[PDB]
Design a protein around this ligand. Sequence first.
Ligand SMILES: NC(=O)C1=CN([C@@H]2O[C@H](COP(=O)(O)OP(=O)(O)OC[C@H]3O[C@@H](n4cnc5c(N)ncnc54)[C@H](OP(=O)(O)O)[C@@H]3O)[C@@H](O)[C@H]2O)C=CC1
Ligand code: SF4
Ligand code: SF4
Ligand SMILES: [Zn+2]
Lengths: 299, 103, 382, 328, 122, 71, 111, 178
Amino acid sequence: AKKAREGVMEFLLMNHPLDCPICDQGGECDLQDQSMAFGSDRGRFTEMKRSVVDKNLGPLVKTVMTRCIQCTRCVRFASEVAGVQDLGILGRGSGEEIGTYVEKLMTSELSGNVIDICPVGALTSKPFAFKARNWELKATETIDVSDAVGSNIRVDSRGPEVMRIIPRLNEDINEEWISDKTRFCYDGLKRQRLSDPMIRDSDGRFKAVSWRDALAVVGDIIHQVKPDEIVGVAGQLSDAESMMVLKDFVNRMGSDNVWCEGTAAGVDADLRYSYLMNTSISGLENADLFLLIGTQPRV
Amino acid sequence: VPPNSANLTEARRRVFDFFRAACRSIPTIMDIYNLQDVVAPSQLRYAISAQIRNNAHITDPKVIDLLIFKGMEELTDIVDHAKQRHHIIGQYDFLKNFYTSNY
Amino acid sequence: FTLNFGPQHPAAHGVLRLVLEMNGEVVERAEPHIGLLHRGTEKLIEYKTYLQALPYFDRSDYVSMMAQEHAYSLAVEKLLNCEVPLRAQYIRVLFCEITRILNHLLALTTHAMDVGALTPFLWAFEEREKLLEFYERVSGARMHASFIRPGGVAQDLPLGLCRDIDSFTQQFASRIDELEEMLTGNRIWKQRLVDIGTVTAQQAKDWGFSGVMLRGPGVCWDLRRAAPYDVYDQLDFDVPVGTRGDCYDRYCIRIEEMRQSLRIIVQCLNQMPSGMIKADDRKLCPPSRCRMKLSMESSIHHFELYTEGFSVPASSTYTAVEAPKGEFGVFLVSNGSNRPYRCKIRAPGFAHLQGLDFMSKHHMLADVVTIIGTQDIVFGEV
Amino acid sequence: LARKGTGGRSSVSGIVATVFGATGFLGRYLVQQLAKMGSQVLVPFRGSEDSPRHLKLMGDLGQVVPMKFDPRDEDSIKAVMAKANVVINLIGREYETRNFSFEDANHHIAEKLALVAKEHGGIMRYIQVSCLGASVSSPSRMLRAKAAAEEAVLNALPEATIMRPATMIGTEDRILNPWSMFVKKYGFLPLIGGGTTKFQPVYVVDVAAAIVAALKDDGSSMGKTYELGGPDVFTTHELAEIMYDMIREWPRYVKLPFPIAKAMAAPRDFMVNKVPFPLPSPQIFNLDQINALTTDTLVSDNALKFQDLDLVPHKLKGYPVEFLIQYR
Amino acid sequence: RCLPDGNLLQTKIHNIGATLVGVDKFGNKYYQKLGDTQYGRHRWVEYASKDRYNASQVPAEWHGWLHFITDHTGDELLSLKPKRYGLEHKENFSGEGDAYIYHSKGHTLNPGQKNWTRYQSW
Amino acid sequence: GNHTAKWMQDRSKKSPMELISEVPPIKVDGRIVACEGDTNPALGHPIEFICLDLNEPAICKYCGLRYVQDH
Amino acid sequence: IGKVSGIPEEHLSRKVIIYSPARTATQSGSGKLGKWKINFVSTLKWENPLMGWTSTGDPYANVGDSALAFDSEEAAKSFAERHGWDYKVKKPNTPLLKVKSYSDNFKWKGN
Amino acid sequence: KYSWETLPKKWVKKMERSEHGNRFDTNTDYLFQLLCFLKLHTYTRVQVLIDICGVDYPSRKRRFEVVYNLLSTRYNSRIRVQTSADEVTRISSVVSLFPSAGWWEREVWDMFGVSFINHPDLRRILTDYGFEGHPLRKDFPLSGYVQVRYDDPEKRVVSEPIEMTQEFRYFDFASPWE
Ligand SMILES: NC(=O)C1=CN([C@@H]2O[C@H](COP(=O)(O)OP(=O)(O)OC[C@H]3O[C@@H](n4cnc5c(N)ncnc54)[C@H](OP(=O)(O)O)[C@@H]3O)[C@@H](O)[C@H]2O)C=CC1
Ligand code: SF4
Ligand code: SF4
Ligand SMILES: [Zn+2]
């Protein structure tokens, strides 16, 4: 068994380019961690490795197919889980090349997870082009709030900013896959952020006053308004706590006009089946027939 | 010193022993570090008692033994000129937090 | 009567902060104060890989650098089972022994400068600036040569280093003779050292001296004869062992141990096999620059050995070599991970400087610097 | 301001200050406050580069950037205040020097820094530091100048805080350290005017804590001339009574009528005459400090005190005077 | 000569038998007195700035030959200095005024003090 | 450039990006090149085999050098 | 054992999270699972304005991840409860080894 | 090994190894009694306490593990008697047998907190004077809690405020597949 493993890990590292320093997945690599653990310490191949051009797979998956070992994991992921069927194992022999035969950006969402699927640097996040390394990133087992599926997540942060948002196993919501809305929304958290409480001056532009002044002006303007005229529209990303605090605030202010951003007029939030996915997101695996009433669940 | 604290009783006995030791040593403390004018003996006794009472809810005997040992260490390093004096003088609602930070 | 005897000459014994409880001029007890040089070495090593851990060892004892890297390497080969070549062993000893010479040349004549002889210091330091032309040539840094890596040794000698070490060994018996003719015969030396800090063997054993302070008392105990940890079982050398234990025996030993180290240098030179420099196990030894660039499987190891590390298997060993100060041993518990786990460093000078309390009882206050002299107390290890 | 930190010594406070008088007794406490609450300090020094060396510490790696500048030459003051949002002014003298006269060191500079900060639009808070009782028609030309400085810094730049610290005590001060080292004239203390002066000293740490507290405050404390008086309104003789408690010496005062003093300080007032030689900085007998010593106007009136900064000063007994122990 | 106020006199007491091996651009005359005696003292440099000299004025072309690391006089490594990115020496202007001294990109003395806040404010 | 405007504040010495975008692409024979580094395979980067099937020059990621098929 | 441990008072009212680090999604290898780690949130990290590097103020910045890794939730909870931290244990999500075979790729779609 | 036959079975209580240096992981009560054996014994003569290595296993229940090394200059052998004592268990001190244990046990208490019974002068040896906290534990952060020290208006004095520094960057090198 050990000789078979060493044999194969020599073949894989035979036509494989020495891209480990410039490979984005240099630290987090199955090939590096299997060669450094089960593969042989030396390589006898001293000849001309094969090389492969870099296919354009869109603004998400940076592709360096020379590194790719043609294990076919991604061409299976796009055909089965992602279900879009764009990737392919074009050609035969060592000349095998993985990707779309015609220049075809991976129009499918959910196809940014091919990077976690990929056991090799080849398919890597182009947004996370090279910005960090597998060891710098301090990982927090956060969740996601983009879409209401509430997929699990690892916010790989280096210091004060979010370098890379990577999924993590939670078989009951998202097995090991997260939408491209969640993988690459981390860039938002550092752009156009509001960082100072700005009130409006006597002109029309903002003025970054401190917190005392902004809270004072807001408090005064709620004191000088009719109670039934207060409304508390709560954002779509707001947590449960701040929505509870918003409810308890605009309530004791004499109003009952707090509501989430998406729920239109007259929602029936009495019985909890009326706004839940009663069958678990895992429960849908036992379903025989689906009736997606509108709902466009791919989107 | 062996932990004769096979019960809270012996531990409390040696707590009182350490308290008497610190109290009867306050003279040299006030002398070496010159607190006989800024602090009163009542106040230093008050502080030692507030220390021994702040950690009074220790139903574990060995933890009390170790606390008394840390206290004896602190005292012995205060009696002698091992530590300085500018700490000995120092050793002796939501909105107001929110305005400062996020934590 | 308490006296805060500090560093008499700074830059020689750096942070020496004894608190002597005297009796006139006779010292009744010497209470050394440690921690003034307590860098977080036994904590910082738990946080870094086995490769990043090595540079701390040349910074543990600052006058005998490579002996501690050699004691660490032999503690991450005791676990790794990492068989190193013959050339790595011979170079590793030719530099552990050059380090014994670099230390005795300092710890004799810095001691002899604390006693008062000003010139042996500067002659021995010209000799040391000749040996740092070897350290600096073989690795790069004159003092901290992070050169004796876990598997084997960092990189081969330059193509002119054995010729120069020979041209130095030929002229080094004379330098020892001068250091000896200037100090051994002197009646102002013997008087300053004979019957000073006499340690009966039971005391040198009790207080775990295990160095040149365990062979003063007459205990024939050298961990190069007891536990031969390299070619030492092949190399011929006689361990000089004192007969009285006084600081004049430990000096005579350190000045003979500086000749037997010359024998070991000349042997390591005359028999140095042209073999590989590092262990062939490229998962414990980063491959050469030429190979990792040309070979993909070597590049992967150069990446997982300069970032990940060895991940030496789970064990716990106490590897102790005969460093110049004494038995420098590094007790290296190793969790399976690539970072060590409580790499405790038994360093002589923590056991020797304990001996100052009983060595310098009833000795005159001016002797308390002679004791600190012959203990070779270097506070990096304390 | 744009604060991103927790405490200081590595935090940020959005205060890139230029404490004009940092290389001075008040300056070392103010710079330490501003750079221990984690904010940049552009300490500008006048001469020897050894002046602000004691300020390269107390600030973390560029939180204190000592800079060179000529007091009379602008385009250098503008360079020191290039990257700055706070500009404190501690540039003041108690003694006329042959090169810089009382106005050219107390008033004609504070007005100049005020103007060249006004031009450099962006100086949010400009604190102006002048002695208490520095009102026009005060005898000491130092206080008349320091009053004109206030009037010209407020005019040329409104919403500019003006601290009015009274004589400040502390280590390396100009009030107690001259009396000691004159008690080293065998306990002989020449309290002038008979100690009838009523002045309110203040621990320099608390003057600094007030100068920073008007920075951390809101839009208030702008254009409002505080009076950093302190507690325990003293008299010169009574203050000397506390020195002899710290330095182990027996009180051996003498009284000096004001004519006798002004005659004893009649020399060292030819500063503009003796050109080829600078005089040795009159420490205790200063004709202008004596003119100020005459009238006990150095008491905090109903103007703003430490209470309007949520701040209460330390006493003058105990630690805030324990710098005298080094004289025992 | 005319400097009895420096150790430059020790160098000028050398050169009595020494041969001059090349001279770099700055004027530093690089001497060699081998064969005679005292290894380690057979290669030096006369800084051609008899006052205000200091170390590190020796360019990289010679800083090898002069520390005995190599045996290639700077007149031989000057055919190896890279033309595309080659840069002249800078004497280590440490302390000699700002804009000569080096500055990081936030020092507030560096023209163009960059802001490190990773978040782009609104 | 803009990336190079983050670490280089000199802006008078040509930015490395331009120094490499102004060197011409190297003609070769086969469909795979070596680009071992400058010249000495031990003083250059790990050997990076580049594919020249495309018409446009294929840059070497480590060194920026560009290779074309030269059929 | 919180008071005898010398830890300052303000760092024993800390709120920790005793999780088990999930598998790095990028690499399909379970050699880093089952090592429960206390997670002192330690979120406060600004950017030291002189140089581009960051600068924490919390002492417990790294030791949550580095060198403090237990082997079982019971030992980790016992640790965070001795020292008096307010631990909220976040259970690890483990994978279902659903039965799967090769011959299911070549399934017959009847007709 | 001869030492295990003669030794009372109860003294080598918990464990015993047979390579990488042999060890007798004993119990804290039988420790100084076990250290009395192996010394002052004709066929086991150690006489030399080389080292006392505190080792902290946070995931154990008896956190620390006071690893007494022991050299036998007579028979040329090295035995590593161990123990296990948590943060509040005073362990027997062997300064009475090997007087070198004085400073080693001061260091074990300083670094870890394993107080030693009837050890005369059991006082923090390595860490700072006013040091609170035990460094070589695991839960003690590398950079320390309050261990920055800078000069200030409290002249001639270096304060001890809360600590702030470039964040120690912990790198997660550890790879899967072990
Ligand atoms: N000291 C006291 O008891 C009292 C002082 N004050 C006021 O507090 C402020 C600071 O006090 P303190 O630091 O003790 O005063 P100092 O007299 O010690 O001078 C402090 C600073 O002023 C600078 N300075 C003074 N004159 C000039 C000048 N002509 N040109 C350039 N720089 C100058 C000094 O530069 P350099 O060091 O190079 O000379 C130094 O940086 C002053 O406004 C002072 O009048 C308030 C109450 C009383
Ligand atoms: S995938 Fe990338 S990091 Fe891994 S072995 Fe291949 S080139 Fe190296
Ligand atoms: S998953 Fe990656 S390595 Fe596997 S075939 Fe696809 S591109 Fe190649
Ligand atoms: Zn290239």
